[PDB]
Amino acid sequence: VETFERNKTIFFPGDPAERVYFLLKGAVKLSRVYEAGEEITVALLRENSVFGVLSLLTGNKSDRFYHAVAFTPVELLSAPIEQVEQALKENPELSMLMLRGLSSRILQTEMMIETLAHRDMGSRLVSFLLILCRDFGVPCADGITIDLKLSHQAIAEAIGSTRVTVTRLLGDLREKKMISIHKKKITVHKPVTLSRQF
Amino acid sequence: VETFERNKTIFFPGDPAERVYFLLKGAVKLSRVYEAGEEITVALLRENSVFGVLSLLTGNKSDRFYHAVAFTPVELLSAPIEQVEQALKENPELSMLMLRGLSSRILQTEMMIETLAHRDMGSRLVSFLLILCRDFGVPCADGITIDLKLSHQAIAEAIGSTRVTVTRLLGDLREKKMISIHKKKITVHKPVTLSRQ
Ligand SMILES: O=C(O)CCC(F)(F)C(=O)O
Ligand SMILES: O=C(O)CCC(F)(F)C(=O)O
Numbered sequence: 001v002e003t004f005e006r007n008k009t010i011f012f013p014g015d016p017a018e019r020v021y022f023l024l025k026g027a028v029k030l031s032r033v034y035e036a037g038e039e040i041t042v043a044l045l046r047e048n049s050v051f052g053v054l055s056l057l058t059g060n061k062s063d064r065f066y067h068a069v070a071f072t073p074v075e076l077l078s079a080p081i082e083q084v085e086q087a088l089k090e091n092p093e094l095s096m097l098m099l100r101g102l103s104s105r106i107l108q109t110e111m112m113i114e115t116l117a118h119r120d121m122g123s124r125l126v127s128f129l130l131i132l133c134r135d136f137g138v139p140c141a142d143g144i145t146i147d148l149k150l151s152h153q154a155i156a157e158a159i160g161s162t163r164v165t166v167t168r169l170l171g172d173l174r175e176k177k178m179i180s181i182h183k184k185k186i187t188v189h190k191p192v193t194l195s196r197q198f
Numbered sequence: 199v200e201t202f203e204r205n206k207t208i209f210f211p212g213d214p215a216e217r218v219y220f221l222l223k224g225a226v227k228l229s230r231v232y233e234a235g236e237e238i239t240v241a242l243l244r245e246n247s248v249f250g251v252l253s254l255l256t257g258n259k260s261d262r263f264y265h266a267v268a269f270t271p272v273e274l275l276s277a278p279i280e281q282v283e284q285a286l287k288e289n290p291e292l293s294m295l296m297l298r299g300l301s302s303r304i305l306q307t308e309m310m311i312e313t314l315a316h317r318d319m320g321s322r323l324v325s326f327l328l329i330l331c332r333d334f335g336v337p338c339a340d341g342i343t344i345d346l347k348l349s350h351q352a353i354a355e356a357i358g359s360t361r362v363t364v365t366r367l368l369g370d371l372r373e374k375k376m377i378s379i380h381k382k383k384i385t386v387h388k389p390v391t392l393s394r395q
Contacts, residue, residue, distance in 0.1 A: 116314035
């Protein structure tokens with residue numbers, strides 16, 4: 001049962017793909033790193049997500065191309081692939097529960113595709129916030145608080161935008177009183193409202 | 199073994215999620231459908247893909263929220279979910295094979311995410327085209343031919359764009375001779391060179 005301070009790396013592009021991971025607490029960011037140094041987020045994982053699944057494919061004989069980072073402080077479990085395959089026999093039920101975990105991962109990615117598919121960057125941002133409310137939301141007076149410190153830069157890397165654009169967009173939303181920000185945590189008021197339009 | 203003609207629906211949003219599917223031949227399009235009929239593609243599936251995985255979470259208890267369409271003529275297998283659980287819990291390693299297929303679905307989707315992250319539509323297009331080269335490509339003398347009829351509208355629905363914009367971009371790519379198109383089949387000339395970028 002391993003822990004990771006916020007922003008520490010769990011695995012680097014190029015590392016052998018030998019382990020599978022289960023997220024216990026916190027959020028994990030998976031990203032692609034381009035030669036220049038720019039990261040694009042491909043996933044923001046919530047608690048109880050299986051990940052590192054490249055290792056279930058070619059296993060130990062192929063390398064990570066994503067970077068996994070503890071987006072908040074993290075606790076997780078991990079095992080080398082050969083150990084996981086075995087525990088599957090000794091438990092043809094664990095097997096079924098993994099299948100459900102991976103199915104959930106698939107559905108979550110598709111939902112981020114929907115988010116990125118919007119032409120209007122504003123709606124893209126609203127749609128991303130809604131996913132976050134679902135994944136990291138905590139109920140409160142004014143609606144739902146996304147329980148993560150979110151920099152504008154981080155939002156930008158997740159919705160294919162730039163810091164500058166995100167700042168402008170978060171501000172348009174605050175003016176309209178549709179969200180609040182305290183210590184970098186976003187509160188979305190009337191979330192079920194916003195769900196309208198898809 | 200079932201077959202579906204090109205453009206036939208395999209399942210509609212709101213249909214109970216009762217089966218899991220395995221695509222043997224052809225391409226299947228998963229899309230989100232909006233009140234007025236526009237559709238957004240969330241996946242173009244290639245041969246040998248498990249799909250319909252919502253029913254592994256919930257079986258027929260909940261409903262589909264994506265539209266599954268035969269993007270080309272299609273041949274597939276499908277089984278109700280309890281028949282699957284038995285097949286698995288009764289077949290230990292068949293289960294390791296599913297685990298792998300779902301793993302592959304996850305990585306394919308993440309690549310569509312990388313494709314959509316680009317801010318420049320030209321690059322979304324090229325990047326989408328290169329994925330299609332890997333998924334449905336047939337090699338030939340002038341590079342790789344995407345063995346799919348791809349209308350401009352279908353491309354637009356997959357990369358978050360309008361048709362007019364796709365047409366223009368495809369126009370650019372031909373003028374620059376990075377692709378040619380013949381009868382909706384796109385050939386990418388020197389894809390490995392385009393990959394770098
Ligand atoms: O397994 C990889 O190497 C990256 C992590 C993942 F993208 F595969 C994931 O499980 O989503
Ligand atoms: O099962 C769904 O409802 C649609 C198809 C799928 F998203 F589930 C899939 O397996 O990608």
